[PDB]
């Protein structure tokens, strides 16, 4: 009656864009990147070593001054480090210890966290009295919550495992938008440098671009064979890297609507727990789970480095705003703060 | 400096407060509570008192945390590593669903919707050494059911004997036959009674026996 009415219509829809994506696909990225130099041996040393977490570390986020950083561990502590002198500024205790994400406000006044308790609490750092206190709990998601990201002091986008991403107004405390196109569990978020779009990855093996003011799903990209675990934006704001459980990273261009470069090696067939980019967009840093991070080069697709100082698997990593550092938390309760040495 | 010497003073005031909450958090028992749906999980938490419903029921000199993941309508492969370090796993199965098929896809009589689950939980890589408490929930409810129909609808390879106390030799051993890694974890088993102690005292003394076999493996002997 009507089941194959729009099913066979849907076969017209994708086939209108499947070969159209191949139509503007004139040459391989690994054939026009032969012109440039390789990056070289990226040997990086754990300068500081932030110890003090007592369980697995599930997310960390750098402040905007490239000096403070917040790390959220699975024993239910949020800890703000002075990453210069390896000392604690604040240690925020959490109402539910099942944290899967954390974020730093770009003004520094606020930190948020959420996880398996389905709420993204935000915390006021710089207040009149001495302590950090919680400002608003943003309830309204029905899945587990996997990424909080602040747009400014009053708007924060959260993705969740009820297949929905949302936009919020923290002053009022309720969703101004909801972004529903995903079919599987949404695992990642990456706000744009202009903060006008974002991309979010899901367990349907597809990632999608959104608009924060419109509310509709702007683009949709396939290419992976299992769950997407991490998305960050390129420093363009015009590209993103998806790290998946298929042991691969892949790089999409939003204006080109399809993937360009795939980062894999035959000797590694475990997942990719976190992704971040560097200041040039020349170093893709990706925290795998054969217990070490791999520093991929985004233009050549080789393993440019290894950061092998971690006991258990690398669950999070973030690179600064100016490119000066990269922390990696992991499931063995340390943050190795790396830096390249002359 | 001189203001930095009061930053460092404040930071090891933080450090001696992390390491006082983290020694009072390795002294508490964490138990993932699982189940296949209508499994009597509400019955067990009634004895011991939108995402995690973290229940604390500390009763005999021993702090207890029980994490009901009941409402998570999402992929369990994506948040089950959060419970890797955990003491036990209290798995519930109602025994009065042995001829009760599911209305999902004319599925088998809900024990193949529990042996479906138990074989996935017991052979999961985060729970290779996580010893699993088993509960058989409806004891005096399927004694009425076994008279009306035997356990041949569920498994037609059973012996017979048509008795309430036969079904342990049918059903209970059929779950512990799915325990592939038999060296590392020891499936405990019980029959969930309405008595005050014997459903919560059993979780107490069979988590002492996880604790002791954790220390003996950690202190070299076992």
């Amino acid at each position: 009656s009507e089941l194959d009415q729009l099913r066979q219509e849907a076969e017209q829809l994708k086939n209108q864009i499947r070969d159209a994506r191949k139509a503007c696909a004139d040459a391989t990225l690994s054939q026009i990147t032969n012109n440039i130099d390789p990056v070289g041996r990226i040997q990086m040393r754990t300068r500081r070593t932030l110890r003090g977490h007592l369980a697995k570390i599930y997310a960390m986020h750098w402040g905007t001054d490239s000096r403070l950083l917040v790390s959220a561990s699975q024993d239910g502590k949020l800890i703000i480090w002075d990453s210069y002198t390896t000392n604690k500024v604040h240690a925020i205790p959490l109402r539910s210890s099942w944290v899967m994400t954390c974020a730093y406000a770009p003004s520094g006044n606020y930190v948020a966290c959420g996880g398996l308790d389905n709420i993204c609490s935000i915390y006021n750092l710089k207040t009149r009295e001495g302590n950090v206190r919680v400002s608003r709990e943003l309830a309204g998601h029905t899945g587990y919550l996997s990424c909080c990201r602040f747009l400014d002091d009053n708007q924060i986008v959260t993705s969740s495992g009820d297949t929905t991403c949302a936009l919020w107004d923290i002053e009022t405390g309720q969703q101004t938008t909801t972004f529903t196109g995903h079919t599987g569990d949404v695992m990642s978020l990456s706000l744009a440098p202009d903060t006008r779009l974002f991309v979010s990855g899901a367990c349907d093996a597809s990632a999608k671009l959104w608009d924060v003011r419109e509310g509709m799903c702007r683009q949709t990209f396939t290419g992976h064979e299992s769950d997407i675990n991490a998305i960050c934006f390129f420093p363009n704001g015009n590209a993103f890297a998806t790290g998946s459980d298929d042991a691969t990273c892949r790089l999409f261009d939003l204006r080109a609507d399809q993937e360009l470069m795939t980062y894999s090696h035959d000797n590694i067939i475990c997942g990719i727990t976190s992704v971040s980019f560097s200041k040039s967009g020349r170093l893709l840093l990706a925290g795998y789970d054969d217990f070490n991070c791999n520093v991929w080069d985004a233009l050549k697709a080789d393993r440019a480095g290894v950061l092998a100082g971690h006991d258990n698997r690398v669950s999070c990593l973030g690179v600064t705003d100016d490119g000066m550092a990269v922390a990696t938390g992991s499931w063995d309760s340390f943050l190795k703060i790396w830096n390249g040495s002359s | 400096s001189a203001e930095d010497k009061a930053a460092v003073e404040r930071s090891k005031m933080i450090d001696r407060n992390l390491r006082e909450d983290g020694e009072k958090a390795a002294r508490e028992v964490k138990l993932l509570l699982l189940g296949a749906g209508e499994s009597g999980k509400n019955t067990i938490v009634k004895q011991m008192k939108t995402g995690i419903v973290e229940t604390h029921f500390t009763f005999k000199d021993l702090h207890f945390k029980m994490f009901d993941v009941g409402a998570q309508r999402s992929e369990r492969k994506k948040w089950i590593h959060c419970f890797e370090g955990v003491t036990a796993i209290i798995f519930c199965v109602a025994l009065s669903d042995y001829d009760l098929v599911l209305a999902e896809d004319e599925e088998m009589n809900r024990m193949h919707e529990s042996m479906k689950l138990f074989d996935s939980i017991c052979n999961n890589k985060w729970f290779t050494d996580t010893s699993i408490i088993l509960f058989l929930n409806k004891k005096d409810l399927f004694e009425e059911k076994i008279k009306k129909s035997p356990l041949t609808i569920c498994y037609p390879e059973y012996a017979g004997s048509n008795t309430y106390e036969e079904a342990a030799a049918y059903i209970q051993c059929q779950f512990e036959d799915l325990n592939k890694r038999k060296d590392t974890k020891e499936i405990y088993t019980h029959f969930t009674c309405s008595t005050d102690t014997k459903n919560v005292q059993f979780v107490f003394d069979a988590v002492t026996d996880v604790i002791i076999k954790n220390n003996l493996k950690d202190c070299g002997l076992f």
């Epitope: 403070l68 002075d82 604040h90 001495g130 | 930053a7």
Partner: single-chain antibody, 233 residues
Framework: DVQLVESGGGLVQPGGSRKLSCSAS????????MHWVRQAPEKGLEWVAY????????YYADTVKGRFTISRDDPKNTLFLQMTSLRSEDTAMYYC??????????????WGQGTTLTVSSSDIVMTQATSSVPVTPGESVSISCRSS???????????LYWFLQRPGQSPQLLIY???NLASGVPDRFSGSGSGTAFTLTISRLEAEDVGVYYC?????????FGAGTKLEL
């Protein structure tokens, strides 16, 4: 919100002893380092003591070292000071000042209302050569003071602390660490300088920016104020 009201004293003979107490309310008292700062009649500010957060570090002033003792009580939220064998030089109004030190904090922001105590009958000095400026509102005024040492430390920051004591009032933090503006201050005030010479540049005066404009250092102990630059209108 914050309130630090202290008490105790009013007339104690020389050779006697008087205990001061500063009762705190409205803030997380056990996170803050406390101080005491005294102020003689018709004279300037001068530092007395210190207790760090959690009673770890205690510094004193060399005029009172051994005669004075400082004690905090974190469950009761009350700062003490016990003073022995009182001299006539110990005639001052005593202020209870809070302070917190982590990365980026503004110490010395909230000052208490003050308690007078009268009796009957090597380190850096800060120099404010100016003692009186009679002006009119609406125009820019730069207050400047000088240091013995280079206040720029090797980590990067320069510990000079500007203050303002309105007539009949308590001091308040204008510019902490020589450059940054505190909480509750208007944006008209600003501080700058390099190394040894600094300047506090108000761009447009008001009828309430008139008062004595002190400068303190915090590079090393003791903490030393100079005599203030009095403004008139």
């Amino acid at each position: 919100d914050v309130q630090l009201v202290e008490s105790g004293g009013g007339l104690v003979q020389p050779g006697g002893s008087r205990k001061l107490s500063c009762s705190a309310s409205g803030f997380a008292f056990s996170s803050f380092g406390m101080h005491w700062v005294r102020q003689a009649p018709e004279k300037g500010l001068e530092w007395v003591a210190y207790i760090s957060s959690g009673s770890g570090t205690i510094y004193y002033a060399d005029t009172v070292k051994g005669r004075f003792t400082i004690s905090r009580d974190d469950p009761k939220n009350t700062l003490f000071l016990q003073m022995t064998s009182l001299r006539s030089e110990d005639t001052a109004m005593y202020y209870c000042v809070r302070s917190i030190y982590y990365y980026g904090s503004s110490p010395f922001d909230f000052w208490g209302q003050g308690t007078t105590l009268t009796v009957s009958s090597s380190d850096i000095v800060m120099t404010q050569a100016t003692s009186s400026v009679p002006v009119t509102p609406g125009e820019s005024v730069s207050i400047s003071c000088r240091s013995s040492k280079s206040l720029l430390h090797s980590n990067g920051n320069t510990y000079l602390y500007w203050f303002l004591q309105r007539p009949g009032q308590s001091p308040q933090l204008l510019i902490y660490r020589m450059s940054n503006l505190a909480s509750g201050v208007p944006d008209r005030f600003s501080g700058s300088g390099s190394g040894t010479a600094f300047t506090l540049t108000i761009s447009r005066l008001e009828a309430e920016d008139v008062g004595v404009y002190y400068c303190m250092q915090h590079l090393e102990y003791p903490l030393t104020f100079g005599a203030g630059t009095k403004l008139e209108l």
